[model samples]
Target: QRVKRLLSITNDKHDEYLTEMVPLLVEFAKDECHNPFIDKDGNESIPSGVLIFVAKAAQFYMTNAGLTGRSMDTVSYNFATEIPSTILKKLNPYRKMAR
Candidate 1:
């Protein structure tokens, strides 16, 4: 719910896809973080940082799914096929603690 709102989706248009994506990313983040706030076990409240990370990654996945660059007026962006470093930074505390 919070993630959907963060993604600026006011409806269920992408719910089907997001339903699939969110959990997948959650698991990915979980493994990366050594399994904090894991979804496969008991009902655990997700951390705010993790939520933000997921939303950020989701936006990246949605808008920048694939493309080298989009340019205009001497400005351009280099995209990625991987998650951004900043996004992964959010998991640092959890990752460290879990070790």
Candidate 2:
């Protein structure tokens, strides 16, 4: 809900409008910087390592793209290459054990 709301706010505004949304943006950042993902059980689904990787990659892309937002294709591409090389390796041994 929070990510969607933030994305909506970004989408509704001109690129220059980010300057005006700084306060809300800071709140959004704080919200995300804490735990953001929720599972069907209403619990945090993002593991700490995965969260760190996501934060880094998201920040990298957003910085380069100027908050144009990530397309599914871009995200998939990053996941396919970057994540597997890093996090996936750590996760593979525990895949079947995931709840």
Candidate 3:
């Protein structure tokens, strides 16, 4: 769906990125999403907005989102690796470790 959405806008398949990074992003989503407030039920508490953030970040970088071919916007860049502050805002209170 995300691949199709990008294609609809950019008109490019970007198959290489989809094939390589989509799977990685999907795996990351599955592995990363979880809320600590739950008393049980394990890691099934991911919210929609959180997943959307993940997907958008993945697509953003995959599309070479930057000034020319050297950069890829810090928001998305940090989201992918450092976990963007926006998402962190949602997760920080739930963090298991100390600040």
Candidate 4:
């Protein structure tokens, strides 16, 4: 919801949106961040800045997934790819770089 709001997305059915997008992130980040870790006190830890890409990717998936109901106006709920594209570009610096 935070991410959607940041991007000016006002669509409803956020639960459905989350369902379609979270697993998509798993697939997309598979080869990218392989070393999720446990913190000193046992809480898990991950690299910073992941939400930067994750949220945008979710939006991309939701945008492509189409609406979940009848009686809605597609023309009004449209998305702009440029937002996700720019987010992807920024992620280039965070790519695996595992040479």
Best by TM-score: 1
Highest-lDDT candidate? 1
Worst 10 contiguous positions by lDDT, candidate 2: 18-27
Candidate 2 runs further than 4 Å off: 1-44, 67-99
Going through the candidates in order, what is the number of backbone clashes in each? 0, 0, 0, 0
In candidate 1, list every pair of residues with a backbone clash. none
- Once model 4 is optimally superposed onto the true structure by TM-score, how far is the C-alpha of residue 51 displaced, in angstroms? 0.8
After the best TM-score superposition of candidate 1, give how far the Cα of residue 96 lies from its true spot, in angstroms. Answer: 4.3
The TM-score values for the models, in the order shown, are: 0.47, 0.30, 0.32, 0.37
- lDDT of candidate 2 at residue 8, scale 0 to 100: 49
Better of 2 and 4 by TM-score: 4
Q: State in Å the error of residue 12, model 4.
A: 7.4
Q: List model 3 lDDT by residue over 29-61, tens digit each.
A: 444543242327542343445445444544455
Candidate 4 Cα outliers beyond 4 Å, as residue runs:
1-16, 19-28, 31-33, 37-46, 68-96
lDDT of 1: 0.48
Cα-based lDDT for every prediction:
0.48, 0.37, 0.41, 0.44
lDDT of 1 at 23: 43
Q: lDDT per residue, candidate 1, 1-99, as tens digits?
A: 466555465124453443334445455446654655655665543566666665665555544443332342122222222446666555445445444
Candidate 1 local lDDT, residue 17: 43
Q: What C-alpha root-mean-square deviation, in Å, does candidate 4 show against the real structure?
A: 8.4
Q: Which ten residues in a row have the lowest lDDT in candidate 4?
A: 74-83
Q: Between candidates 1 and 2, which one is better according to lDDT?
A: 1
